[PDB]
Design a protein around this ligand. Structure first.
Ligand SMILES: C=CC(C)(C)OC[C@H]1O[C@H](O[C@@H]2C3=C([C@H](C)COC(C)=O)C[C@H](O)[C@]3(C)/C=C3/[C@@H](COC)CC[C@H]3[C@@H](C)[C@H]2O)[C@H](O)[C@@H](OC(C)=O)[C@@H]1O
Ligand SMILES: C=CC(C)(C)OC[C@H]1O[C@H](O[C@@H]2C3=C([C@H](C)COC(C)=O)C[C@H](O)[C@]3(C)/C=C3/[C@@H](COC)CC[C@H]3[C@@H](C)[C@H]2O)[C@H](O)[C@@H](OC(C)=O)[C@@H]1O
Lengths: 5, 236, 236, 5
């Protein structure tokens, strides 16, 4: 899972 | 609804209490009350709104992925037939997730986006709109899947065009939008190349703009450039 | 209520899904449904029930303590008068906490304790009864405070007398009851000496009984003896 | 805060 903000 | 009799300043005050207590569902309901007063939100209030819902839908998404994973496992060759329960409970979480996304989108649509004239508020609300459609795309399965993915892309794209015209490359909202649109490309739109190209040029243009910044009123920007780099490292 | 149309085995199955997804409120509602079928719970089912509510009320207690701490701060000499909001929001969390404790206690009272004839189920339900009254004592403030503390002590004491008669000193339920009753003495009943004496003799009698155990079907017991030791280290 | 189970 990649980072989001 | 339920917040109609509470003072606007009392809703904002309670949302900040709920944040400190990590009570995100209460936090989201206070902020929904505050939005429904019909006044614009300040920069600090926007942040409360987005944090509250990010956290509520974040826990729903984590639960949905546990259940969906269990469910896919029970559909493999030689898996014991466990009955309707896993699908039922997955659909329950999923429909609660979708209702929260519909609630956020209804707030954006009535009337946050339309009254947002400054770039920072407009971009911020369009980003949220992109994210919530994206959350809906993650679970979308039938006819609607294409249309939902397109509403996400369309909201993100409009936020990108404005952010590029009106904000410096190190603006934390501009940076967080690019991070998230870039994840959309990778995980939803099946466009890993567009994802990588966007995070890279985002990261590089922000690097080249650090010299204009005070050292540091830009901790949020630093943090986001790091997440762009972590995504690039996962992907390349 | 809402679980009246679902199969008992489907409630237990969904509670285990909800546990894996860390969805404790759903987990507690499935287990309340299961209890309300009117059959006894097995050892594994008891554990699901107690974990679900421990976690729901655990997050309420953590939030209540953040808010109560804010509230006490706003009552210090020279603190700015912030209005009714902190007390209001503290009371909201507190009344939701109390309703969950009342729901657990109503389940114990209708009809888990009365139908529990084996020591392990009887002690288990009396421990839960002690804990939920204890949670109520933590927030209790008016006339009821003494009576609530006594219902806690009385439930814990009856569980202790049975556990001492019917269970070996290393039984994990017997050990967890002593841990919790001992915390009750320290934090609620203003009896730090009784707390320390109980954890010590509990720890020592369990030590002396380890030699009878398989190595290890007793991981839960090991863990609890450690928490007795950590409490003793905090307190002495 | 002391441990409980
Ligand atoms: C919810 C309120 C609190 C916890 C007080 O504020 C959350 C945070 O609020 C602001 O940070 C925002 C912000 C985040 C920062 C990247 C966090 O930065 C640090 C160093 O913690 C994540 C938050 O969710 C939030 C509000 C969201 C967004 C995101 C929203 O899209 C619609 C776009 C990028 C990012 C922007 C708005 C950041 O400015 C602040 O600039 C941060 O303060 C500092 C020192 O960086 C603060 O931690
Ligand atoms: C909720 C279900 C799951 C997570 C599957 O089970 C929780 C746990 O269920 C059992 O453990 C119980 C148990 C706990 C153990 C001390 C945890 O042990 C380990 C090594 O993780 C804490 C749990 O909340 C639970 C169910 C509760 C109690 C407590 C209840 O009072 C009314 C009294 C003491 C303790 C007893 C009942 C323990 O036996 C088991 O014996 C544990 O399994 C092992 C390997 O120790 C398992 O992790």
């Amino acid at each position: 899972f990649p980072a989001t903000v | 609804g339920a917040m109609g009799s509470m003072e606007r300043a009392s809703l904002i005050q309670k949302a900040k209490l709920a944040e400190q207590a990590e009570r995100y569902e209460d936090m989201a309901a206070f902020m929904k009350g505050a939005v429904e007063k019909g006044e614009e939100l300040s920069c600090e209030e926007r942040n409360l709104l987005s944090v509250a819902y990010k956290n509520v839908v974040g826990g729903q998404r984590a639960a949905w992925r546990v259940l969906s994973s269990i469910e896919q496992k029970s559909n493999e060759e030689g898996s014991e037939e466990k009955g309707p329960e896993v699908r039922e409970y997955r659909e329950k979480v999923e429909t609660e997730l979708q209702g929260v996304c519909d609630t956020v989108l209804g707030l954006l649509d009535s009337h946050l986006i339309k009254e947002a004239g400054d770039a920072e508020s407009r971009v911020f609300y369009l980003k949220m709109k992109g994210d919530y459609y994206r959350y809906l795309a993650e679970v979308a399965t039938g006819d609607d899947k294409k249309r939902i993915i397109d509403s996400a892309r369309s909201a993100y794209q409009e936020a990108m065009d404005i952010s590029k015209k009106e904000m410096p490359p190190t603006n934390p909202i501009r940076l967080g939008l690019a991070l998230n649109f870039s994840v959309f490309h990778y995980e939803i739109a099946n466009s890993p190349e567009e994802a990588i190209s966007l995070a890279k040029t985002t990261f590089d243009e922000a690097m080249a703009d650090l010299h204009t910044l005070s050292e540091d009123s830009y901790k949020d920007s630093t943090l986001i450039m790091q997440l762009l780099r972590d995504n690039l490292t996962l992907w390349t």
